Amino acid sequence: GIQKCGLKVISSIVHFPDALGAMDSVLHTLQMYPDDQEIQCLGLSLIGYGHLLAKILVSSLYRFKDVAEIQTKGFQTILAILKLSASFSKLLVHHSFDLVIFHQMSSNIMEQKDQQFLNLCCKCFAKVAMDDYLKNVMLERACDQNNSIMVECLLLLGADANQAKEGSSLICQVCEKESSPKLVELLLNSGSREQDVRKALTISIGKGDSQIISLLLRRLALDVANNSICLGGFCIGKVEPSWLGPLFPDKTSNLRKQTNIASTLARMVIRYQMKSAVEEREYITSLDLSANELRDIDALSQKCCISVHLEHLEKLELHQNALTSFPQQLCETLKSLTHLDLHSNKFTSFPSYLLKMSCIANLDVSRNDIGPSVVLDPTVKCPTLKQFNLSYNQLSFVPENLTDVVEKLEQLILEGNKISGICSPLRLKELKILNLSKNHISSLSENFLEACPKVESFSARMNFLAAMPFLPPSMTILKLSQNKFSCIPEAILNLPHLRSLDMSSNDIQYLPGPAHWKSLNLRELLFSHNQISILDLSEKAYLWSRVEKLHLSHNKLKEIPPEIGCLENLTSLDVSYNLELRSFPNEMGKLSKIWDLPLDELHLNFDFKHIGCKAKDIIRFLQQRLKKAVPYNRMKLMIVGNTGSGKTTLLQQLMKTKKSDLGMQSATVGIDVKDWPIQIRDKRKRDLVLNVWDFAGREEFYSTHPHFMTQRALYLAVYDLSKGQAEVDAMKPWLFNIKARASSSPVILVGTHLDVSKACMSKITKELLNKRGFPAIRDYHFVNATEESDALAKLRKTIINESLNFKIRDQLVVGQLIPDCYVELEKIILSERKNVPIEFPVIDRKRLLQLVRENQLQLDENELPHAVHFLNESGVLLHFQDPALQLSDLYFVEPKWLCKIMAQILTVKVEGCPKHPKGIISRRDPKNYMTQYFKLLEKFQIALVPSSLSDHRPVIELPHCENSEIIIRLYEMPYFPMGFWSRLINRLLEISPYMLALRPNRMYWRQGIYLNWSPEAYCLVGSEVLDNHPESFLKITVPSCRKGCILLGQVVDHIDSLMEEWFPGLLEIDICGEGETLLKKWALYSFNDGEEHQKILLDDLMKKAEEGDLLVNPDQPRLTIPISQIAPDLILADLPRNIMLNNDELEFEQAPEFLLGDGSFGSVYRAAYEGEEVAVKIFNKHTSLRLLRQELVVLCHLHHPSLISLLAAGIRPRMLVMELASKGSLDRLLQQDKASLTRTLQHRIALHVADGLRYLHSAMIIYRDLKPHNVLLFTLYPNAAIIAKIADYGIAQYCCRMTSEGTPGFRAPEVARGNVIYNQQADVYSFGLLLYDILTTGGRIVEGLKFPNEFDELEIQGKLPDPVKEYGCAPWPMVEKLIKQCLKENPQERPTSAQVFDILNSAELVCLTRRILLPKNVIVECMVATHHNSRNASIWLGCGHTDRGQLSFLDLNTEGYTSEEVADSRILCLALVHLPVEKESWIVSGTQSGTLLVINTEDGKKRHTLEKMTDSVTCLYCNSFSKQSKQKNFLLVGTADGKLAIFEDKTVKLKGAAPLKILNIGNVSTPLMCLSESTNSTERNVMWGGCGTKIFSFSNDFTIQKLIETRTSQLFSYAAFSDSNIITVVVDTALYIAKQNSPVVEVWDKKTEKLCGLIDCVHFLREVTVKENKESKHKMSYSGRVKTLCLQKNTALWIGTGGGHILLLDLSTRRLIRVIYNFCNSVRVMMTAQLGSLKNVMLVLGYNRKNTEGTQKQKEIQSCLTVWDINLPHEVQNLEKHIEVRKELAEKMRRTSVE
Ligand SMILES: Nc1ncnc2c1ncn2[C@@H]1O[C@H](COP(=O)(O)OP(=O)(O)OP(=O)(O)O)[C@@H](O)[C@H]1O
Ligand SMILES: Nc1nc2c(ncn2[C@@H]2O[C@H](COP(=O)(O)OP(=O)(O)O)[C@@H](O)[C@H]2O)c(=O)[nH]1
């Protein structure tokens, strides 16, 4: 008890002599005498002059929370410490500082005059909250303790509320601690992710809360702008009325303002933050409850709080729940429900009281288990039901009483049921769409449709039907597929309006000719899978001139008659899979409209499908054969041998080259292409000329031969019998490669030696070489090969007879017909071969396109790519259409040259120094040709020379080789094909991005690679020879770990993508004999992990069939091996591990169709995977596993929030799992739900699709097909995170199996013309059209279905019409410009995908409703709207371009600008006075002369110029002053000195009315310039009007009650900003004032009359106009001044600058929201209005001036009225959050790739 005196002494001397373990003892004396004797606890004062200091401060102030003014001594200390050690704050917040600073600022300090104190504590708090992290804990540690006041302060200071753990965060926490509703309301209204709010439901659903739930639903599912509740995807276990209560709107709800407390502290702290930083009705309709698993809805069927808002529902969805027994009481409560659907529920009986509903249509109960009979009560009458869906129930009879119950029914759908019996007359008077598919119907009563005279779309698929009852004469569409028919019944032939007919999969025999159909409107005739013999069209064919689809596939057709050219409109012919056609008629060339034409599984009179022949050229080709076609006699005769034979010395005698002047010739280099004609001097004048290719035999050129071994050729082969019976063996490889490359070509063995001896070699050729896997040897001779002889002459004869009988697939190749346009093209190239630089005979397409000009060739740019290819197969010129090899401009004429150059490199050796290993070589060699040289060799892959490369293999010693860590897979084949290794080791070589760009150091000899990253990941594609085996194997050993399972599954692909691309006859099932298949890809497995002494072979074909289970095991079934280990590619184990199917959780029913709901009659089903809803895609027999594995590799690494993402993929069966687009594709939406798109969902869809293209075009992959059918919506809630998602499977099937031209309607001009390769600018034109169908809500497609040939051509040139003038839709004039950019003809003039999104991300395009270009050179400076008529509105303008005034009426929907002179002096302002009587609303006009004129709304002739004033009228107004217990109003003419004349609303008619109270306020030197009225109506609409520089006010008294003056302002930086005239003033909780040429607004106050805020403009403009505006450095005399003010109700303040900008200031919390520039030049007038029940718009009358004649001291002004959606300040910040959440998802999705 002496320490008090000790500290009292120290406090004295610590001051005067500047005292310097003082702080130590004065600290421990606290801990020694704590919680007592506050006098010694005042020692804190000395601390103002080891973190123990922290722990001793927060513990002192807290324990004395409200003791005395020791807090003032505490905080002073804490403030003194902070300003010198700013780091100290990290220690305070670390302790209990939160516990003590939250109490002070909230211990009822408001309402208490301790302003001196609070300013201290806020100053102290201003520094604790400096660090970005500290706010995030100052906030989090203010939510645990329920503190609404402070949690609001820390939000206005930043401190994001979505940061805690991401998976878990504040809202999940705040909902666990049973917080206050006011606390949740602040996190949601601030930054708060959707994925965290949704998790807060299930947390807050478990517990029963009525105010914490109803605040989460309001943010998750309530589209107030569209009157909807989108509670679909949520798995809310049960719905209760107490939750949906506060969602429905209430008109009585109006609140006070109490959060201003937290708003004051928000700015006080911000003030001290800167000062320390600067110096140093409308009942909602849609209610969706889809996915919520509700086992009962009874909770709504009571008289609860919402039973008065449900009576205006008009739509209710309960599909995919588990409901049953729709409650009787409810269906009588919602007496306005007009769209009810409840399908996939577990019903078991039709309620039959649902029809008692008042006004119902589109009742949809269509997947439940409704019992046998569904009899409707015969005493209920529902004349409003239009569509009665009952599909996929369990009905066994048609519903009973449709006629007596639902009279006006339109679409009775009954598919999927089990309807069995012969039906009943079904006397429905207004059916339009029947449906009876998938039932078991045997036959219909002959009077079935005898009472429904309006049917249009009867459809009975998959039944057992044979005859048709009378069909009414009104049928249009009629589908009868999968039935059991015999002949098209005579009742269908006589339908005089039929317009489509699907009769697939029936067994009909005779398709009647067009003279039997009695209806000229045939459009489609699907007849696939029938048994149709003839296609009789000769009797009369023009009757089908409109047919647009004639599907005849899978029929027994024999020929296509020539009259099929009469079907001029035929758009999609389909005659595939006929197997007996053999010919297309040359008349088919007249089908100019065909865009697809399948050729699958039928052999024609030409060789198609090279890379082209895309069903459009085939029509051109067949058309050129109609002008003049001539036979083409030209074949290839390949000569083949091996380093010593009669190849080049037998040919010289075959051609009978008489000279052979070279006494001694040399071995061949290259292949020596030559041609000799054969003029067979016989009866047949066919002078065939076949070109010989005497291949070189030396084993070093073999790497290049497979390029020139085509399939249209007759191969020779030469023994060299001198080495009898030993050379025939050495010739098997050649015969094998002939079999590998060209299986269907003949072979003529030619024993070349007789002169020198052994001729029993005909035995082995007949024994082993004849018919064993080798090609079809058609002869064998034994010529002499050095002199003409009888033995040789009979060989020359066999070459002829074997050529003229080539006949591949019964075609006789040597004598086919081709268009003379080709033969003439052949003659000019040969005639040009003599006129080309021998050093480089190559020709560029430029030179080629001129050769046709010199002659009269009728070929176009679409013909040459086919023409010049048909000349390639014939060996006239070489040309390669590969896109990767960038030489397709080079056209190799004189093939014998290129074929010689490619072999000069393989012979150039160096007998100098072997400084390099064998096989590698650098560029050691004319004019730029050497550069062109290996710009072709590298293109030809021969560059490092993969041939002649270190045959001897190096002894590799693999790290882990213990028989259980390695995976092996042999490829036993009889001989390595010719160009196998040099091709293989050059396909795996260039793949460095394995394990994806880390290149592995590799060592590749001639027949191996062995590229290894580490002893844990390698791949050795070797080649060894087994023991006692003459085959040739390809062993591939890979480590069995995860990084190794990838390499195997990635090499086996390349080695197979090569085998079928190059040697397709290796993997060819030879059904003759047995299925040897010539290539047996074994796999190796061993049960003993190590020391197995052998690895047992196991064919892959047999093992792949063992996919029924997952384990393999021997005949001793104790132990077993997982197939993953031995062949991890058949099982999808190489792809990312997250996509293993894991069948234990996938619940999926393939067989049923009621779960196949996706689309219509498709293949992708619906299922559940990990408890969530997904969409599995069952694959048919088409897609082989090798391709499915080829597609998944590209789908697995897209990972975008705007691309359908995979979830799993597996076998049993080959299925593919993806996300379930809940609301289905987009095309189905705008086809039947056109009211759901609401001008802000039309945008988020276009933004999410332009976000997908922003990523696809980033990964260098073009979509190539973007249509309203490929966009899969996910929810119809506008302010959601994932709405649209473009289906990404389409590109996978293309990038693997390469609709490549795109759907006709949704197609670019560069892709339809087909003459130019595509670009990324094709997906933009296709997207530009997608914006045209979203804008017009699918109006082009609906009309495009009955004009399909004009559906494509109209848009294929940019000639499609205006989206507004044609189709009725709201303008949206900032996207009609984005269309007119993405719809340009030039490809590189359309905005790239990154730009088409950066101008969709703008939040100003989505609000600007319609820009209205005023007539040229009209100067208007005043406007007024008409709000008493809400049917439609008009804007009465003024005029300035004349000194004599004139009003300018202007509509809004017709935009008819009208001129009517009404005065003789320029007009300055107007006002609109309405009278509740007589139904009129006059307009008043203030002009410079003072003539106050008034004219009627209708009559433009009844006018009376009221009592003229003295100065120029400047401001008028119409008020709300009804103070006589009834309706009454005045008008306030603002003269230019203050003679405010007040009037009456009904007295305006009389000429010269009575100015009630002329209140001369100021002087002639004080002109009035504005007027206003209060924001609230509680204070009796106190008026606040400006005058000169003196602001005033009044009330019902009409006397000045305030005379605030602004020039006397004591905050002078500049003076005349306040010493100038006023312009406008708006009334709120404060006052905002505008002066002439003032770039600042002045925030005065009502009571205090002080400058509470000063907001300069350029403080915002100069912060964005820094880099994007560089020239402004000379513009220090800035332009842009406040011209007008407009204050939204409580949200933002619209400031119109003298420039082109417009300011959005959130008057509550944050100042700058956005500055909307570059849309005008001078925002001169701005005000609000309401338009046609789409109220609350913000008219903005800007200017526009172009200095066309600025040198003539004149400017051309164009006033540009606009209309902004008043919800703009929300949208601009609601969108900037919408992009943040998607950026946060676009990155986290990129992490699932690496993780
Ligand atoms: N993930 C998904 N979620 C929801 N619906 C889907 C999904 N994927 C596809 N669908 C719908 O399923 C239907 C079938 O789509 P599919 O891809 O089979 O069409 P398609 O490719 O034209 O058919 P086909 O290949 O037989 O021509 C489509 O109408 C589509 O809208
Ligand atoms: N004595 C003889 N020599 C032949 C016969 N046929 C070809 N030759 C020789 O084969 C050589 C032709 O080279 P060739 O083996 O065709 O070269 P490759 O095309 O590279 O295999 C000539 O020099 C001839 O001497 C023949 O019937 N009798």
* Nearest ligand for residue 1231 CA: 1
Phi-psi region of 1295 (alpha: psi -120 to 50; beta: other; left: phi over 0): alpha
Distance (Å) of CA 1781 to CA 185, 989, 1775: 20, 42, 10
The closest alpha carbon to 696, from 655, 727, 651, belongs to 651
Q: What is the rounded distance in angstroms from the CA atom of residue 986 to the CA atom of residue 1459?
A: 79
* Nearest ligand for residue 903 CA: 2
Q: What is the rounded distance in angstroms from the CA atom of residue 326 to the CA atom of residue 312?
A: 19
The fourth-level CATH superfamily of domain 636-805 is: P-loop containing nucleotide triphosphate hydrolases (3.40.50.300)
Taking the centre of ligand 2 as the mean of its atom positions, its distance from the CA of residue 1659, in whole angstroms, is: 94
* Nearest ligand for residue 698 CA: 2
Strands 1745-1746 and 1011-1014: unpaired
* b/e map 340-361, b = 16+ CB within 10 Å: bbbbbbebeebeeebbbbeebb
Q: For the chain, what's the residue count? A: 1795
- Listed in order, the ranges of the chain carrying CATH 3.30.200.20 are 1135-1220
Phi-psi region of 945 (alpha: psi -120 to 50; beta: other; left: phi over 0): beta
Tokens of 473: 């004469």
The per-type count for the chain, helices as H runs and strands as E runs, is: 46, 60
Are the C-beta atoms of residues 441 and 398 closer than 8 Å to each other?
no
The CB density around residue 443, as the number of other CB atoms within 10 Å, is 16
* b/e map 1298-1329, b = 16+ CB within 10 Å: eeebbbbbbbbbbbbebeeebbbbbbbbbbbb
DSSP code per residue over 1577-1603: STT---B----TTB--BB-TT-S--B-
Q: What is the rounded distance in angstroms from the CA atom of residue 919 to the CA atom of residue 1136?
A: 37
Are the C-beta atoms of residues 1440 and 1421 closer than 8 Å to each other?
yes
Q: What is the rounded distance in angstroms from the CA atom of residue 1504 to the CA atom of residue 1485?
A: 11
Tokens of 228: 């909807």
Are the C-beta atoms of residues 125 and 105 closer than 8 Å to each other?
yes
Strands 1702-1705 and 1693-1697: antiparallel
Phi, psi (rounded to 5 degrees) for 1727: -165, 165
Amino acid, res. 210: S
- Percent of the chain that is helix, strand, coil (3-state, to 5): 25, 15, 60
The fourth-level CATH superfamily of domain 1238-1398 is: Transferase(Phosphotransferase) domain 1 (1.10.510.10)
Phi-psi region of 1635 (alpha: psi -120 to 50; beta: other; left: phi over 0): beta
Q: What is the separation, in whole angstroms, between the first and last Cα of the chain? A: 67
Tokens of 1119: 């132990």
Which residues sit in the known binding site? 641-648, 1156, 1158-1159, 1162, 1164, 1175, 1177, 1218-1219, 1221, 1225, 1228, 1269, 1272, 1287-1288, 1366-1389, 1563-1566
Tokens of 1720: 């005008």
Nearest CA to ligand 1 atom 27: 1162
Q: What is the rounded distance in angstroms from the CA atom of residue 1665 to the CA atom of residue 1672?
A: 8
Distance (Å) of CA 345 to CA 300, 319, 324: 17, 7, 7
- Listed in order, the ranges of the chain carrying CATH 1.10.510.10 are 1238-1398
Among 596, 1163, 1164, residue to substitute to test ligand 1 (most atoms within 8 Å of Cβ): 1164
Q: What is the rounded distance in angstroms from the CA atom of residue 1496 to the CA atom of residue 1637?
A: 37
Which residues sit in the known binding site for ATP? 1156, 1158-1159, 1162, 1164, 1175, 1177, 1218-1219, 1221, 1225, 1228, 1269, 1272, 1287-1288
Q: What is the rounded distance in angstroms from the CA atom of residue 546 to the CA atom of residue 523?
A: 6
- Listed in order, the ranges of the chain carrying CATH 3.40.50.300 are 636-805
3-state SS class at 1175: strand
Tokens of 1676: 């220090």
Taking the centre of ligand 2 as the mean of its atom positions, its distance from the CA of residue 654, in whole angstroms, is: 14
Nearest CA to ligand 1 atom 17: 1164
**CB within 8 A of 379, min separation 6: which ones?**
none
**CB within 8 A of 1351, min separation 6: which ones?**
1304, 1305, 1340, 1341, 1343, 1344, 1345
Q: What is the rounded distance in angstroms from the CA atom of residue 828 to the CA atom of residue 891?
A: 14
Q: What is the rounded distance in angstroms from the CA atom of residue 570 to the CA atom of residue 547?
A: 6
The closest alpha carbon to 1382, from 1317, 1308, 1479, belongs to 1308
Q: What is the rounded distance in angstroms from the CA atom of residue 1721 to the CA atom of residue 1761?
A: 12
DSSP state at residue 627? H
Are the C-beta atoms of residues 471 and 492 closer than 8 Å to each other?
yes
The closest alpha carbon to 61, from 34, 87, 81, belongs to 34
Of all atoms in ligand 1, which is nearest to the CA of residue 1220? 3
Q: What is the 3-state secondary structure (H, E, C) of 1123-1171?
A: HHHHCCCCCCCCCCHHHECCCCCCECCCCCCCCCCCCCCCCECCEEECC
The closest alpha carbon to 1771, from 1704, 1699, 1702, 1701, belongs to 1704
| Reported structure resolution in angstroms | 3.1
Q: What is the rounded distance in angstroms from the CA atom of residue 399 to the CA atom of residue 419?
A: 10
Among 1225, 1229, 1271, residue to substitute to test ligand 1 (most atoms within 8 Å of Cβ): 1225
**CB within 8 A of 115, min separation 6: which ones?**
none
Taking the centre of ligand 1 as the mean of its atom positions, its distance from the CA of residue 1220, in whole angstroms, is: 11
Domain spanning 966-1129, CATH class: alpha beta
Among 649, 652, 702, 731, residue to substitute to test ligand 2 (most atoms within 8 Å of Cβ): 649
Are the C-beta atoms of residues 1333 and 1230 closer than 8 Å to each other?
yes
* Residue 679 bridge partners (DSSP): 687
Sign of CA dihedral 1763, 1769, 1770, 1774: positive
Taking the centre of ligand 2 as the mean of its atom positions, its distance from the CA of residue 648, in whole angstroms, is: 7
E strands present in 1561-1673: 1622-1627, 1631-1635, 1640-1644, 1653-1656
Taking the centre of ligand 1 as the mean of its atom positions, its distance from the CA of residue 1269, in whole angstroms, is: 9
Q: What is the rounded distance in angstroms from the CA atom of residue 832 to the CA atom of residue 893?
A: 9
Q: What is the rounded distance in angstroms from the CA atom of residue 1703 to the CA atom of residue 45?
A: 49
Q: What is the rounded distance in angstroms from the CA atom of residue 239 to the CA atom of residue 1746?
A: 61
Q: Which residues line ligand 2 (CB under 6 A)?
A: 641, 643-649, 665, 667-668, 696-698, 752-753, 755, 784-786
- Listed in order, the ranges of the chain carrying CATH 3.30.310.200 are 966-1129
* Residue 525 bridge partners (DSSP): 501, 550
Phi, psi (rounded to 5 degrees) for 954: -90, 145
* Nearest ligand for residue 642 CA: 2
Catalytic residue annotation:
1265
Strands 1640-1644 and 1631-1635: antiparallel
Is it true that domain 1135-1220 has CATH number 3.30.200.20? yes
Are the C-beta atoms of residues 1284 and 1245 closer than 8 Å to each other?
yes
Taking the centre of ligand 2 as the mean of its atom positions, its distance from the CA of residue 720, in whole angstroms, is: 9
- In the sheet with 363-364, reading across from the earlier edge strand, the strands are 228-230, 286-288, 315-317, 340-341, 363-364, 387-389, 411-413
3-state SS class at 1196: coil
How was this one solved? cryo-EM
Rounded-to-10 torsion of CA 853, 854, 858, 863: -60
Tokens of 1677: 């005399």
Which residues sit in the known binding site for GTP? 641-648, 1366-1389, 1563-1566
Q: What is the rounded distance in angstroms from the CA atom of residue 1456 to the CA atom of residue 1024?
A: 88
Q: What is the 3-state secondary structure (H, E, C) of 910-956?
A: CCCCCCCCCCCCCCCCCCCHHHHHHHHHCCCCCCCCCCCCCCCCCCC
**CB within 8 A of 400, min separation 6: which ones?**
373, 374, 375, 376
Q: What is the 3-state secondary structure (H, E, C) of 1020-1056?
A: EECCCCCCCCCCECCCEEEECCHHHHHHHHHHHHHHH
Of all atoms in ligand 2, which is nearest to the CA of residue 647? 16
Phi-psi region of 995 (alpha: psi -120 to 50; beta: other; left: phi over 0): left
Distance (Å) of CA 1575 to CA 205, 549, 1583, 1686, 1725: 40, 66, 10, 12, 20
Of all atoms in ligand 1, which is nearest to the CA of residue 1218? 1
Peptide bond into 585 cis (omega under 30): no
* Residue 1083 bridge partners (DSSP): 1098
